[PDB]
Amino acid sequence: EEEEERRYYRRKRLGVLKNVLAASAGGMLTYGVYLGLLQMQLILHYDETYREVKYGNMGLPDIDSKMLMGINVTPIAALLYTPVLIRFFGTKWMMFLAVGIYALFVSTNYWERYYTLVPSAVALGMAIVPLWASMGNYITRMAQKYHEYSHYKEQDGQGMKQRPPRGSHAPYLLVFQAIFYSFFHLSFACAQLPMIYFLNHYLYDLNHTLYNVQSCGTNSHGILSGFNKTVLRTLPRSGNLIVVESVLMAVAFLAMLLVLGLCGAAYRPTEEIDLRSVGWGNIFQLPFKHVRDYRLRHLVPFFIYSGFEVLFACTGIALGYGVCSVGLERLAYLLVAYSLGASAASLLGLLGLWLPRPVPLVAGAGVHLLLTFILFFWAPVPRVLQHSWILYVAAALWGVGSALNKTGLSTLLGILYEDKERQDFIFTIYHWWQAVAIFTVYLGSSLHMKAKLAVLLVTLVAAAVSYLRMEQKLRRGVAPRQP
Amino acid sequence: MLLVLGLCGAAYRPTEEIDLRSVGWGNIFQLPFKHVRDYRLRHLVPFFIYSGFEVLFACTGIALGYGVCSVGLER
Amino acid sequence: TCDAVWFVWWVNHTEVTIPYLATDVTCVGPGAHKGQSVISLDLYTCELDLTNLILFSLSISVSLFLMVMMTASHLYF
Numbered sequence A: 001e002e003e004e005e006r007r008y009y010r011r012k013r014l015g016v017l018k019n020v021l022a023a024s025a026g027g028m029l030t031y032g033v034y035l036g037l038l039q040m041q042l043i044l045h046y047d048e049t050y051r052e053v054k055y056g057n058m059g060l061p062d063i064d065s066k067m068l069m070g071i072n073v074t075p076i077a078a079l080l081y082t083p084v085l086i087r088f089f090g091t092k093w094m095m096f097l098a099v100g101i102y103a104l105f106v107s108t109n110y111w112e113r114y115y116t117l118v119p120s121a122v123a124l125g126m127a128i129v130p131l132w133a134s135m136g137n138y139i140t141r142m143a144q145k146y147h148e149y150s151h152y153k154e155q156d157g158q159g160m161k162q163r164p165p166r167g168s169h170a171p172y173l174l175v176f177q178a179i180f181y182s183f184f185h186l187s188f189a190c191a192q193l194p195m196i197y198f199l200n201h202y203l204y205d206l207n208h209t210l211y212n213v214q215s216c217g218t219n220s221h222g223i224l225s226g227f228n229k230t231v232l233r234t235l236p237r238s239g240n241l242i243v244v245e246s247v248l249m250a251v252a253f254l255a256m257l258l259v260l261g262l263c264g265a266a267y268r269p270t271e272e273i274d275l276r277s278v279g280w281g282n283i284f285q286l287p288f289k290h291v292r293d294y295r296l297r298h299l300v301p302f303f304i305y306s307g308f309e310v311l312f313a314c315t316g317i318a319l320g321y322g323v324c325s326v327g328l329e330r331l332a333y334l335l336v337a338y339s340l341g342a343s344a345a346s347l348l349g350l351l352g353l354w355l356p357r358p359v360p361l362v363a364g365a366g367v368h369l370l371l372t373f374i375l376f377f378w379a380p381v382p383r384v385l386q387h388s389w390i391l392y393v394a395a396a397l398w399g400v401g402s403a404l405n406k407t408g409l410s411t412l413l414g415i416l417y418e419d420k421e422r423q424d425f426i427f428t429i430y431h432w433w434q435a436v437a438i439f440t441v442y443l444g445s446s447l448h449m450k451a452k453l454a455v456l457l458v459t460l461v462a463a464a465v466s467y468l469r470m471e472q473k474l475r476r477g478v479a480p481r482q483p
Numbered sequence B: 001m002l003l004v005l006g007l008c009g010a011a012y013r014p015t016e017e018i019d020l021r022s023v024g025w026g027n028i029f030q031l032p033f034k035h036v037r038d039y040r041l042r043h044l045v046p047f048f049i050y051s052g053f054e055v056l057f058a059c060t061g062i063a064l065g066y067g068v069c070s071v072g073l074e075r
Numbered sequence C: 001t002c003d004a005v006w007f008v009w010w011v012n013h014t015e016v017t018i019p020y021l022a023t024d025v026t027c028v029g030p031g032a033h034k035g036q037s038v039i040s041l042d043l044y045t046c047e048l049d050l051t052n053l054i055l056f057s058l059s060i061s062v063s064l065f066l067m068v069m070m071t072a073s074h075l076y077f
Ligand SMILES: *[C@@H]1O[C@H](CO)[C@@H](O[C@@H]2O[C@H](CO)[C@@H](O)[C@H](O)[C@H]2NC(C)=O)[C@H](O)[C@H]1NC(C)=O
Pocket: A208, A209, A211, A212, A227, A228, A229, A230
């Protein structure tokens, strides 16, 4: 009897595929609801009318600043407690804890007070890094399990009992990472649905809210230097706000429940008791001992640039250039165009599989670089509605570059390290450095310009990637050993 | 600065220098990070934090917090 | 402002002779609500009977309960 094992392995492969799909869907849904709520709060809490009639003597800007601080600073302390937490709960349970903390943060925006928003922001900043760490580790582990299942089904006795792939799981990991990043980028588009369906119809034209903007673009001198005091024409009824927040809470609840139920268990407690053979007095120092690795000293600038570029695409293009010609009427449209461009770039990078590994990466390092040039010389006049497709195509190309960069980084990190602990540590370091870059951009706000720093960082990243490639081809043969 | 430079001489003994160079540069950067596993540090670190807190509270908290009430910047 | 929301309601449904109710008694603020007449005012800004706190409390309780239940299920296998 051989058809029984065939059907068993096919069902296991289908289960792995649907688990990856459900994990990606839940991650993108919670990221989208979080981004939408954050954008709605940032737009609604920047006006004298709403702040003075709903709260007044409550310190709303102070609350917003404290929330931003607790979100952008706490990841630093989150690094110190993420390895033991991700290895104590598990690879999937960490995602559930993270989406639960995200739902808690979404719920804490109902009453909107200090003692309920500060701890929620602290928890969100504490869980933002372990969320991405567990997500990447789970994606890589499920891709490796898919590959070894397929290779054990097609090769029974030819496949070794230990270490099957030998670096042959790239076509099976890239296909999963492509759809994962496509969903993660469509999350940015889904985040703009509440603003379009409820917030885009309550703000007046740009003739009054974009009046004190004498110069923008290259002469930014800050995130938002010139801007009107109010932005809402009419005040939204509490019924609409409460119903849209209830819809957001319900969709976050659905995302969390689909993450919890449609994932099952892919941990194998044998791996748990094998990991417990290492101890707790060494796991706290393992990521600090992996600093002596040679590839990290050149991949860290790559991660810092990834964080810088994602935070510049989230704010620098929408609030720096897309706000000049058009006001807040077409900001969500610019974001959805960026999201569609990134989703197309996901499949574009998926198509580039026959070529070797470091082909699109440096290619990306050029394309958006060209955009940087366009972001350095060209400066759009704010008080004219002459050209609108230039911002659209710029956002599309920047999203393409960002998505291909992200998928190439993830594929490189998945193919460079294959051990479970190795992948966990690499993803933890990557996400810690991404959070550090986010915090640096947060501190780098209200500055003159951030394009020169961007081009310097991307040049250093291209140089470091070329150096790492040319030294890996010459067979350096260096790797740390900390079992 | 001149009395520190001149009235000190030299108490290094280059033999100790060449003995310290036998350790290397790729390990001295991690030695203080490896001494975290020491048992006495995990209990002496709060002592140091309190020392810093109390010296900065004596520099500012008593002069600019209590000594400024009754008398101004005269005393 | 909404600080005395029922005041904004009191001018809407009450039969008391108040002349010049739509052109003379105006609003000094705040911001976009300057020059507004008191009779043409309707402010749903302030939350009504405290159901927002009930909903928030229920949501955080459901979230923490699901978290605790799933952690206990993972601990108990
Ligand atoms: C924000 O926009 C409002 C208009 O929407 C500006 O108010 C105008 O101010 C000028 C300057 O004196 C007056 O001549 C206009 O009559 C005002 N318009 C009104 C009252 O509708 C306001 O100055 C802007 N503020 C900032 C900081 O840009």
